[PDB]
RNA sequence: UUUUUUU
């Protein structure tokens, strides 16, 4: 219970967890462990974590925090063995793979067993496991089955500056649930908190600190600024490669045809250095989260070898997204190119839209971004703007996302967790109470609440699904429009990224391949044959990588969408949600799916503004926008239903399917009843409609 | 005229 017992039992020849001897690597790798900074507080932690229920820990990147302090808690309870888990919450998904391995073999136990890790398609634990590493994301969900947590003994809530939704709802309830629960212990982790603000947040909580860093970080900053930052970060990756001692380069962008753009150029510039001035080896890895796991853990691959003993030394080259901004430890990394962008969701209030900018990083990501390096040997970080524009023009800590997202989903989550009162539901930042209210009145609309705010049968059933409330009711009253199987695909294929491919070399040829699969009447429609001509491909025994490369269609996307479409099943058929089809050849086929469709996409709903205009008009709300360029719908209705909102440098709708405004009021008649409708084009339209609908009834 | 993440 104290540290010098525990580091006794960790210094004995056999394994405490697994009855078995300890391996050499084992005490290698205790021997390095030892020499961390969290280590010479480990004692001051253990009276603080008896002493407290909940408890702020801060200390450097690199310092121990993630990989030691789960196990110090581990062998706190090591004398009495409950049955009860430890969590470890990682904002990324990376993380808590790589993560959760590297302590699997600090415990010389397997992965998967004592220690595991839980993500969205992967559950790699067992009934052994007694530390847990998962995305907050995952155990949000798991509480939304289980209010108490009872699963858990202690809680850990990492990098939580970050303040993602899952993470700021997590605290709401962990900090609720620490009054109700005195057997629950809560430690929050950061190298970059604002540690007043999360003590004041838990009731005061204990602060404790480790001062000390393991290897430094040199900073350089470029003199004067770069409107380029591609081609800089292309250009300072070169130079390293071509000048520096050896060292692997981590490079971050915004996005992945940014980042694909990059490994492309870098590959180029490398092969002909490579052929005509002797230059060293370099493999580029890729590194975005639309990656299949099996791809992001190649980042982790070894360097190559020099071409010739002597030789210009090889090395690797991680290209990617802010997704290795935290938490990860890449070994070899001597290099971080830090160009200061990243892609952030902004919400605007007026508009209902939310949306997708490119924005200069946060100090906070900056100096986390930088911690990736001098964590095995001392690093380098590339800045690629100027030290003058990082202490003035650079935001201290990044808008938590709550402040910057829709919210329909959120509060749902909140009533199905059990939220009496949202108004004074303690969030550690509330967001603004005209996003709220809207919120309220949009699941108002969907009947997933009472007009008290309740929640109703519906709603609960639509919280199950790992999908937006619309897209969720959709998927729920699709029997009544006898398709819920194609639906089912349907609402699979828009959780994932466009599965259609269009290189700038081949887009006349690429547009070609997809017209073969183009539906005169909608976008979804598109969707669900080019899913069936590739299950179709499938079933028939043929390989789909290529298959999908000469019809221009996402392998990745395709393949990602089925394993939505697995678990999306799994819970259908849990809540006896009916699975029915109509005959591809029945007349009402096409008819049927446009129709459920509408079932939980009522209100986002586009009117074309006159008769020979391509501008359409949103109801409600009366926006102007546009049909975005890549729609399979040659004429369009002058109704439509899209799914999504886009803002390039003009206003679009996207993915849109031809309705018939009579479908509106038969679906819909609580939102549209047309008292409610004011002076406008589309309520005058809709009061014909209507009224032709009431002739129709002799 | 790309999905930054996560379920
Ligand atoms: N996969 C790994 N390979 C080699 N060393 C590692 C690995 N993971 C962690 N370490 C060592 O342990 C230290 C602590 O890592 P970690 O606990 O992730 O730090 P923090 O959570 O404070 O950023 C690292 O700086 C590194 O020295
Ligand atoms: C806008 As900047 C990251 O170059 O200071
Ligand atoms: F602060 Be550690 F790098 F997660
Ligand atoms: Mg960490």
Redesign the pocket.
């Known amino acids: 219970t104290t540290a010098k017992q525990a580091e006794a039992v960790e210094d004995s020849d056999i394994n405490p967890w697994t009855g078995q001897r300890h391996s050499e690597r084992y005490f290698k790798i205790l021997k390095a462990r030892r020499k961390l900074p969290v280590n010479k507080q480990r004692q001051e932690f253990l009276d603080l974590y008896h002493n407290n229920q909940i408890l702020v820990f801060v200390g450097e990147t690199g310092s121990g925090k993630t990989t030691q302090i789960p196990q110090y808690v581990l062998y706190d309870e090591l004398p009495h063995q409950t049955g009860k888990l430890i969590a470890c919450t990682?904002?990324?998904?990376?993380?808590?793979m790589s993560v959760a391995q590297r302590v699997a073999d600090e415990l010389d136990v397997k992965l998967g067993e004592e220690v595991g890790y839980?993500?969205?398609?992967?559950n790699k634990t067992s009934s052994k496991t007694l530390l847990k590493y998962?995305?907050?994301?995952?155990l949000?969900?798991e509480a939304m089955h289980d209010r108490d947590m009872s699963r858990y003994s202690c809680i850990i809530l990492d990098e939580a500056h970050?303040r993602?939704?899952?993470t700021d709802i997590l605290m709401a309830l962990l900090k609720q649930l620490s009054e109700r629960r005195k057997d629950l212990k809560i430690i929050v982790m950061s190298a970059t908190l604002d540690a007043q603000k999360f003590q004041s947040y838990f009731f005061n909580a204990p602060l404790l600190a480790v001062p000390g860093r393991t290897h430094p970080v040199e900073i350089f900053y470029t003199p004067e600024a770069e409107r380029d930052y591609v081609e800089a970060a292309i250009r300072t990756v070169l130079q390293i490669h071509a000048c520096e001692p050896e060292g692997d380069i981590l490079l971050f962008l915004?996005?992945?045809?940014?980042?694909?753009d990059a490994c492309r150029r870098i590959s180029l510039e490398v092969d002909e250095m490579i052929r005509e001035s002797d230059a060293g080896p370099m493999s580029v890895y890729p590194?975005?989260?639309?990656?299949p796991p099996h791809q992001q853990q190649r980042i982790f691959e070894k360097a190559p070898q020099p071409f010739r003993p002597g030789g210009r030394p090889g090395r690797k080259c991680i290209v990617?997204?802010?997704?290795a901004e935290t938490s990860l430890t890449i070994d070899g990394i001597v290099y971080v190119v830090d160009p200061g962008f990243?892609?952030?969701?902004i919400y605007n209030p007026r508009t209902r839209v939310?949306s997708?900018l490119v924005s200069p990083i946060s100090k906070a990501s900056a100096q986390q971004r930088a911690g990736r390096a001098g964590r095995t040997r001392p690093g380098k970080c590339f800045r690629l703007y100027t030290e003058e524009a990082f202490k003035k023009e650079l935001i201290e800590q990044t808008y938590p996302?709550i402040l910057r997202?829709n919210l329909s989903?959120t509060v749902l989550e909140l009533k199905k967790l059990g939220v009496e009162d949202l108004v004074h539901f303690d969030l550690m930042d509330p967001p603004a109470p005209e996003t709220m209210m809207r919120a309220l009145e949009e699941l108002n609309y969907l009947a997933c609440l009472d007009d008290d705010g309740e929640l109703t049968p519906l709603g609960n059933l639509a919280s199950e699904?790992?999908?937006?409330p619309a897209l969720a009711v959709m998927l729920i009253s699709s029997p009544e429009f006898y398709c819920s199987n194609e639906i089912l695909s349907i609402t699979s294929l828009?959780?994932?990224?466009?599965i259609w491919?269009?290189?700038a070399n081949a887009?006349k040829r690429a547009?070609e391949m997809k017209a073969q699969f183009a539906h005169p009447d909608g976008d979804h429609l598109t969707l669900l044959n080019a899913y069936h001509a590739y299950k179709g491909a499938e079933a028939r025994g043929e390989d789909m990588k290529k298959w999908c490369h000469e019809h221009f269609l996402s392998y990745r996307?395709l393949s990602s969408a089925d394993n939505?479409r697995a678990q999306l099943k799994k819970i259908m058929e849990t809540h006896g949600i009916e699975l029915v089809s109509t005959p591809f050849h029945d007349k009402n086929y096409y008819t049927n799916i446009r129709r459920a469709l509408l079932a939980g996409f009522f209100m986002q709903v586009a009117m074309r503004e006159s008769s020979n205009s391509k501008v359409y008009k949103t109801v409600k709300d009366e926006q102007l926008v546009l049909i975005?360029?890549?729609?399979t719908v040659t004429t369009p209705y002058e109704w439509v239903v899209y799914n999504?909102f886009?803002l390039?440098?003009?206003q679009?709708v996207?993915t849109v399917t031809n309705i018939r405004p009579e479908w509106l009021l038969e679906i819909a008649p609580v939102y549209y009843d047309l008292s409610t409708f004011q002076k406008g084009e589309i309520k005058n339209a809709l009061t014909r409609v209507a009224e032709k609908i009431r002739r129709q009834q002799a």
């Open positions: 990682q904002p990324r998904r990376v993380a808590a839980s993500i969205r398609f992967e998962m995305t907050d994301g995952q949000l969900r970050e993602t939704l899952a915004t996005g992945e045809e940014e980042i694909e590194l975005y989260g639309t990656l990617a997204t802010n997704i990243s892609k952030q969701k939310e997708l996302e997202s989903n699904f790992p999908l937006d828009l959780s994932v990224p466009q491919v269009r290189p887009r547009d996307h939505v975005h360029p890549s729609t999504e886009v390039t440098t003009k679009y996207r």
